[PDB]
């Protein structure tokens, strides 16, 4: 990795992301929360420090970093992922992290601020949509998701150690927010002649190379060894957004790995169907035109890069893709 200094343009767009009012849907009778990234980050960090867990870093991940670094790129603003570099030794701390996050959820309400006795379970079953605890050999992190619909899904991830989330060059960006949370203690607002020094990172390689890949709409990866199943699906999303490989030679090999590794992780077609239907409903919730083009890109890739010996399973998945198209082809 390497360090880069966010220019004024980037810091401004970051400020807009951090002050953008995001709506959170409330599963059940619970009202829609009108939260803000700055507010959640502050409250969570403050209460984590209060509970005795140091927060070394707070970063902004996802497509949001890329939208900050290059305005209105091709990747879509639906993702808002935060990372809190936090040590997690025992399960006690994992449970504390759940309690702290649910408590800081209670803090945003119009008149329900005084309703400070809603419990953490009704809040989980009303505001949390996805929960993921991981504490293995290398991987060690916790993930809480906020409602995903007409707005944007806010995902809070607490990383103790992580198997280096390498992906395509275009979404390997992290922005260290601490400098900007500190910058507001200023009595006046942020202006062009007066901004904080903010630092961006690339989780693998030269940061300027990834930035170039992001400006020129390039497809790139660096360690295929640690690629898992869903790489192919992400790759097809890049394709449906008019990104091209860095060199047409080596991508025929990458494709085979992604194809082969896909079958290794999803051999049963029912799991495939679930995986695909949920991918489509995640990345193309309302992009009706994008869905058919995506399914046909996938079909092209599967057809050209699936090895001959898996032709049987090949036809089954090509058929699944086709059937999904007929549905996206009626409504």
């Amino acid at each position: 990795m390497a360090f880069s200094v966010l220019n004024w343009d980037q810091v401004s767009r970051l400020h807009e992301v951090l002050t953008e009012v995001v709506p959170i849907h409330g599963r059940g009778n619970f009202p829609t929360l009108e939260i803000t990234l700055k507010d959640i980050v502050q409250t969570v960090r403050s209460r984590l420090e209060e509970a005795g867990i140091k927060v070394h870093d707070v970063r902004l991940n996802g497509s949001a970093a890329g939208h900050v670094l290059v305005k209105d790129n091709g990747l879509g603003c639906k993702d808002l992922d935060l990372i809190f570099h936090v040590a997690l030794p025992t399960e006690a701390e994992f449970q504390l992290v759940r309690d702290v996050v649910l408590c800081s959820l209670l803090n945003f309400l119009p008149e329900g601020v005084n309703k400070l006795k809603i419990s953490p379970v009704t809040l989980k079953e009303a505001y949390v949509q996805k929960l993921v605890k991981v504490c293995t050999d290398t991987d060690r992190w916790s993930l809480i998701s906020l409602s995903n619909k007409n707005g944007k899904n806010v995902e809070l991830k607490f990383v103790d150690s992580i198997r280096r989330q390498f992906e395509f060059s275009v979404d390997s960006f992290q922005i260290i927010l601490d400098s900007l949370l500190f910058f507001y203690c200023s009595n006046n607002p942020i202006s062009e002649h007066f901004h904080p020094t903010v630092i961006g990172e690339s989780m693998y390689g030269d940061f300027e190379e990834a930035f170039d890949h992001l400006q020129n709409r390039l497809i790139a990866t660096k360690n295929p060894e640690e690629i898992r199943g869903g790489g192919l699906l992400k790759y097809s999303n890049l394709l449906v957004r008019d990104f091209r490989p860095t060199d047409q030679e080596e991508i025929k090999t990458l494709e085979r790995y992604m194809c082969s590794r896909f079958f290794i992780d999803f051999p049963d077609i029912l799991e495939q169907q679930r995986k695909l239907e949920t991918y489509l409903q995640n990345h193309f919730a309302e992009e009706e035109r994008s869905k058919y083009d995506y399914l046909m890109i996938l079909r092209r890739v599967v057809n050209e890069s699936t090895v001959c010996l898996m032709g049987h399973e090949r036809r089954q998945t090509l058929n699944l893709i086709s059937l999904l198209a007929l549905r996206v082809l009626a409504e």
Partner: protein, 218 residues
């Protein structure tokens, strides 16, 4: 430590099986992962409260809580999943994991690994390594079965009896001593074959080299 009480299970090469019991469903799937379904009753129907998915090397344990009605296969996982590694599993899950361990362990002891045909008997080394069970099915009807502890014998008549230790081993009708001698020859052979074939597999990474049948009936 959890590692101090049982070893992690190994489901490699084990045939799929769905075993229902009163308080649990354990299944060895086609993927060789091992699933344990916790079943609770609500009047007119039975549901599944949590699911314990165990990897094939049982090293990674995924546990999830969907809400589901009992079915022919385990419920599919949703988003709320927790993955632990063997050494970070909390005591609250140990008893169930040891349940799956005891199931897999028993299945292995009846799942043949090397079958070997001699001129007098069909030997069967099972998969519950190390010190795997060893059955000698003589053609004339006599049965022999060897475990790390006891040694069961059956006779053509159906006289059924068992043995402990070397107190009784030497003292027996010399007709019966012959069967155990031939069975220990077969056992040494099968263990040698297991060791050499495993090492060659270590070098040659590809399709499994077990199960393995050797010889034929006359």
């Amino acid at each position: 430590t959890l590692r101090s009480i049982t070893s992690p299970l190994v489901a490699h090469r084990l045939k799929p099986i769905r075993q229902k019991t009163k308080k649990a469903v354990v299944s060895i799937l086609d993927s060789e992962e091992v699933c344990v379904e916790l079943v609770k009753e609500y009047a007119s129907q039975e549901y599944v409260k949590e699911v314990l998915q165990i990897s094939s090397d049982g090293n990674t344990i995924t546990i999830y809580y969907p809400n589901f009605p009992l079915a022919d296969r385990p419920p599919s996982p949703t988003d709320n999943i927790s993955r632990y590694s063997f050494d970070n599993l909390p005591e609250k899950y140990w008893r169930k994991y040891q349940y799956a361990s005891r199931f897999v362990q028993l299945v292995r002891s009846k799942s043949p690994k090397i079958t070997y045909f001699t001129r007098y008997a069909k030997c069967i080394l099972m998969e519950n390594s190390p010190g795997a069970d060893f059955e000698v099915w003589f053609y004339d009807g006599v049965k022999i079965h060897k475990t790390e502890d006891f040694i069961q014998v059956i006779e053509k008549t159906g006289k059924s009896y068992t043995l402990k230790s070397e107190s009784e081993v030497n003292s027996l009708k010399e007709e019966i001593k012959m069967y155990m001698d031939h069975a220990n020859e077969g056992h040494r052979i099968c263990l040698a074959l297991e060791s050499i074939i495993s090492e060659e597999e270590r070098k040659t990474r590809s399709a499994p080299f077990f199960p393995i049948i050797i010889g034929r009936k006359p």
